[PDB]
Design a protein around this ligand. Sequence first.
Ligand SMILES: OC[C@H]1O[C@H](O[C@H]2[C@H](O)[C@@H](O)[C@@H](O)O[C@@H]2CO)[C@H](O)[C@@H](O)[C@@H]1O
Ligand SMILES: OC[C@H]1O[C@H](O[C@H]2[C@H](O)[C@@H](O)[C@@H](O)O[C@@H]2CO)[C@H](O)[C@@H](O)[C@@H]1O
Ligand SMILES: [Cl-]
Ligand SMILES: [Cl-]
Ligand code: NA
Ligand code: NA
Ligand code: NA
Ligand code: NA
Ligand code: NA
Ligand code: NA
Ligand code: NA
Ligand code: NA
Ligand code: NA
Ligand code: NA
Ligand code: NA
Ligand code: NA
Ligand code: NA
Ligand code: NA
Ligand code: NA
Ligand code: NA
Ligand code: NA
Ligand code: NA
Ligand code: NA
Lengths: 667, 669
Amino acid sequence: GSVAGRIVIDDVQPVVSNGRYPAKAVVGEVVPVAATVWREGHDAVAATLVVRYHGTTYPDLADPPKPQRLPMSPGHTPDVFHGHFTPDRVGLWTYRVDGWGDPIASWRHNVTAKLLNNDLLVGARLLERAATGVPRELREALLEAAAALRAPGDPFTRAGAALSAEVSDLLAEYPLREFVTRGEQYGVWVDRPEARFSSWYEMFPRSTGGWDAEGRPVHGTFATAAEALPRIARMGFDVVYLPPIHPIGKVHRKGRNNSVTAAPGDVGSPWAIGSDEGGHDAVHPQLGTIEDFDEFVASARDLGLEVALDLALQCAPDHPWAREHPEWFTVLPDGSIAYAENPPKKYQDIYPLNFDNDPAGIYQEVLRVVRFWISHGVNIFRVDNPHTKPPNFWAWLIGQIKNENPDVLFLSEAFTRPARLYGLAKLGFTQSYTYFTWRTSKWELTEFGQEIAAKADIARPNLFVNTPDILHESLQHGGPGMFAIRAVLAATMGPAWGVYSGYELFENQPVRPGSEEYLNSEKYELRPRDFESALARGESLEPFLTRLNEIRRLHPALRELRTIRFHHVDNDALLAYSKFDPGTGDTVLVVVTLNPFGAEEATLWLDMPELGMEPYDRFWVRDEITGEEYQWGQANYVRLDPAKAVAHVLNMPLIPADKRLQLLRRE
Amino acid sequence: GSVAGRIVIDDVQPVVSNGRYPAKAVVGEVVPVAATVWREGHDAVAATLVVRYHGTTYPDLADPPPGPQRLPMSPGHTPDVFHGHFTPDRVGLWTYRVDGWGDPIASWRHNVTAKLQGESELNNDLLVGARLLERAATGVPRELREALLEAAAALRAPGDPFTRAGAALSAEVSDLLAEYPLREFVTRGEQYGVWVDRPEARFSSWYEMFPRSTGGWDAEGRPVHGTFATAAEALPRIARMGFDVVYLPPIHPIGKVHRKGRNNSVTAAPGDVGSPWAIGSDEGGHDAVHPQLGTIEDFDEFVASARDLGLEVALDLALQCAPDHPWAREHPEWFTVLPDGSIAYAEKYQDIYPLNFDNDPAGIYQEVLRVVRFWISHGVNIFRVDNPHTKPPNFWAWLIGQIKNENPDVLFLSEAFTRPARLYGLAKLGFTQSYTYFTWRTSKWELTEFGQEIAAKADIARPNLFVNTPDILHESLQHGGPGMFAIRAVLAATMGPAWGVYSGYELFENQPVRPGSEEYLNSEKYELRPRDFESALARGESLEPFLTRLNEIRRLHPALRELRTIRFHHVDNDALLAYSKFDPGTGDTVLVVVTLNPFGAEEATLWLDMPELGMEPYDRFWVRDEITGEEYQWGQANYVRLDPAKAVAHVLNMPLIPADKRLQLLRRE
Ligand SMILES: OC[C@H]1O[C@H](O[C@H]2[C@H](O)[C@@H](O)[C@@H](O)O[C@@H]2CO)[C@H](O)[C@@H](O)[C@@H]1O
Ligand SMILES: OC[C@H]1O[C@H](O[C@H]2[C@H](O)[C@@H](O)[C@@H](O)O[C@@H]2CO)[C@H](O)[C@@H](O)[C@@H]1O
Ligand SMILES: [Cl-]
Ligand SMILES: [Cl-]
Ligand code: NA
Ligand code: NA
Ligand code: NA
Ligand code: NA
Ligand code: NA
Ligand code: NA
Ligand code: NA
Ligand code: NA
Ligand code: NA
Ligand code: NA
Ligand code: NA
Ligand code: NA
Ligand code: NA
Ligand code: NA
Ligand code: NA
Ligand code: NA
Ligand code: NA
Ligand code: NA
Ligand code: NA
């Protein structure tokens, strides 16, 4: 939406909730901008994209308790202008569309249609006026063209210089602009590249302790956890995500397999935060000290990994806050506090917090906890169920944190209805968990991929193949082939993707039939794993996960969300989609089977202009999985055998600069 | 759009260009409002629609040159979306705001009913409920609190939970809470505008006629130049046909310099009348009447004659000049003067100069304003504006703004046959109605897309569907015979809440100037065209009775006033089209089945979208045909046949839609 002046500017994009929230982008991302710009008559109109960097000041998005002048090109959609900008630093960037009348282009159209004396002299006065705004060293071309128009003779000779590409190119750089109408200014918050493009590996530090001589698991420490990091870095992951590392409640502790009663020696859930040993600003005594955690962070950094900590705003009954601050809880008429819930899920080991009784106290206390972890080198937080806490609290918290350190990122674990999922992303959550795991059919995956592309300005997905809470029925019944299928889908549809430890060992047993919970869930017991022995035996997905991360690093098309395009493949068990990088022209096409058992074949009909080609063009592709090279065209035979490869991940011909910016247009 | 507080409100509709322009409505129209409203957890959320009337102050919708009712909103079937509505009862600026709030009593009533478990388990919930009723009672007048206070004591009394929760769940307590709800964390949304015009802005039937062609003929068979007196005598038959707006081409003196001759000839012959759009001569300009029409007093008698017949007058507003118009002599600053001293003609329009609004904006703006106010002072409350897309957009916003602030009942129809961004852009800037691409939409797929687009744009533009204009004799009408004239009139009158006919359409005038042209042969724009409508009617060679019946059907069915309720229904024949509309106010429902083939019979099964008609797929019902009188028993799948020699359409009166279903069918998302 825009402004109405002598020139009209309308339906400007990207604009979120009418300008209530900034759009999202990352450093080095090409941001497309569209605007409808119009005026009266057959007269030429043009637009300028005005871009400015505002520094690292981050806005408060909820109620608590030198600029660049860039050209805009007219599109094939009449009256729509398109531009783009590539932010080169973290912070708040703004853009504005300025509309203007282009008198010289109007003259050029009228004279060419006519090919006259009056029109020719009018042209001369326009070029003379244009020259007053051109540098002294470049004026001549315009002045000489004006003199020719004025001179007597044939109209074709007279208008020759004025209609030339030399004059046209000079004016494209220094235009004679009339009735300059200033559009509304819209914000884009620009984060570091990891906000969009990152590979996550989730692991429990307590499970890194191995076993004793009797095969009994030994509780890991920050020292053993640090030794488990080189293989994760070798697989190409750059974020190590840890469940909560604080002391675990001793009161109402859960036992093995989500049992309401713990037996002696039972470790309990890391999400039951707090005991007499400390709360959210303490480390679990069996893991080590805060100094041992600092050494774990330094080890992760030396391996090129960064740590993401779980931020769980809840308390075990023995957490220090449960005695020191009863106002932070909902006390029932009988004096008791009800255990936390997320229907149908029950959390008997914890109390939910109340943010309404004493907002100032609890806001400052959570801010203190987050600031504490940031000072210990944590710049990423995975936030549990943000949709169960007040939405204005998250906006306040993210705002306070980003104003002190703009590189701190937050991942929203909100498995909720779309309005709240995207609403939380609008309020400042860097990344969001999605419905990925439950999208298994060709139709579901097509709709899912098209939706993440369409929501690119609002939310960044993080596609986890599995989590400690999610072992999908598809992985339970599909064997190793299905493990490979889901990893291809997440790594190529998701610029951010994730794997929870054990996925590479094909762990597929649920607690009971019809459940999505893992049998002997690591949430309630030590789960050491011998990854090196499974690797040695050829029984690991570790080499394949490594290959997927290498393909991602080699192909910048895989950092993109908005460039996803699905191609027609005449088989319900086959899915095909491409992505491109508007920055380099890098293009990737994925052909993946959804059948993990038998072979699948079909004819793949490519949407050639989306690949920057003509229907009868023939071209070479290289499969990044096998190294096999094929010559393809508009219609190609495809065959996938899950025993050899579950997908082709093809390096496609580069899309030229002119074509890639056009294919990036919004409308 | 919205806000984020303790409650979040998002994606509010109707909102035009992010709030830059007000949405459109008319007096008596049900306006639907939607908003996404959400909070944390499983706790209930509710919303209130806050409506205010601001009077007739009209906003300036562009930068000119330097020179409260609390209405309940219902949760919908779409999760997190709330739906409301308001019916403005008077002309002017209305605003609405969505207020979101936590609803603790709805959360309590749900949790308690689910458990209702024994007394020991429910005890805490029953006691929480008692505290909620007391919090609610504080916002209730002292004389009404009793029921809430008694229900709270009963919740605390020992005994069976059913007996304790009884009074708390009673209708009497529930009704009181509906009047004075306990609202927590009230979050106030953004205020959005709705400009409300008189009903004619949406629902009106237009007839275009040239006053000069109402003079008839002399004894030699030569046309006689009509006057305002003969034009008034041509109004009774227009009123009997059921039109309520008579649209006149310009009524001012016509230019003598470069006057166009018959059939768009660049040179006029002595005695040639010229184009009415070549405004102005030494006899006067835009504030003058053509001397052959009569005086300004004869025009006043013409407007009085129109009013007494139930018609209102729409004058053509053409911002351009013949070379001999007073302005071209007195104000050269209002034109683009070329280097040789001449002024180029408008664009091909050789008989006129276009105006320049940029040289002296203050002078020309004030002069156009004086001219428009002059015609309003003579009883003109509607202006049909020529090619507004050729004049600066901020000029229109300023002019409509100045006029409507003084005279809010003045309406403007935009004749902008241009690209969508400018056509809809001018509607957003204030044009009451807009001409459309209607005439060029002839196939089933073009007409389906057309109807769905006009329904999607209802908050921003109101169409006026002319079957023909003096500039457009469509090829479909040139080759389709009388049957096609009847088909296009059904489509325009049933799809368009505003529609129009240009004089001569009822005589089936179908001859173009040359093959491949949309210009009429012997165009009334360049010559006098008297027509003997009475003799054609007596010979049964007129569409006059059919146009009368179409306007009668429109008056009888309020569903035909509507734009947003059009729904197309599947019919198995490429030459048949079917669509319904309903009125959310009364439940009046109409279904049209029309043939696009004027030559032969066409049949098919019509497959109704039964929920869209407030019915179940298995339902059976009666319909009445407004064209023939025939009644039929229908279901979900119905056999239909149209023989254009008998009737080109069925216009069916459908069963009334019940009140709850019709507001639900009006929902935005
Ligand atoms: O100890 C509390 C609770 O922890 C786990 O639930 C977590 C979940 O695993 C996380 O992904 C997070 O997002 O929120 C939940 C609540 O903290 C256990 O699954 C659960 O049994 C246990 O009670
Ligand atoms: O005399 C000027 C011009 O008048 C007619 O064109 C009109 C047209 O009929 C109207 O519908 C209006 O919207 O704008 C046009 C310009 O005023 C004639 O068609 C044309 O030949 C003539 O030059
Ligand atoms: Cl934020
Ligand atoms: Cl007439
Ligand atoms: Na704007
Ligand atoms: Na991009
Ligand atoms: Na646009
Ligand atoms: Na233009
Ligand atoms: Na334009
Ligand atoms: Na990136
Ligand atoms: Na809060
Ligand atoms: Na990707
Ligand atoms: Na709002
Ligand atoms: Na909404
Ligand atoms: Na109580
Ligand atoms: Na003078
Ligand atoms: Na006309
Ligand atoms: Na016919
Ligand atoms: Na004509
Ligand atoms: Na005619
Ligand atoms: Na004719
Ligand atoms: Na007549
Ligand atoms: Na309407």
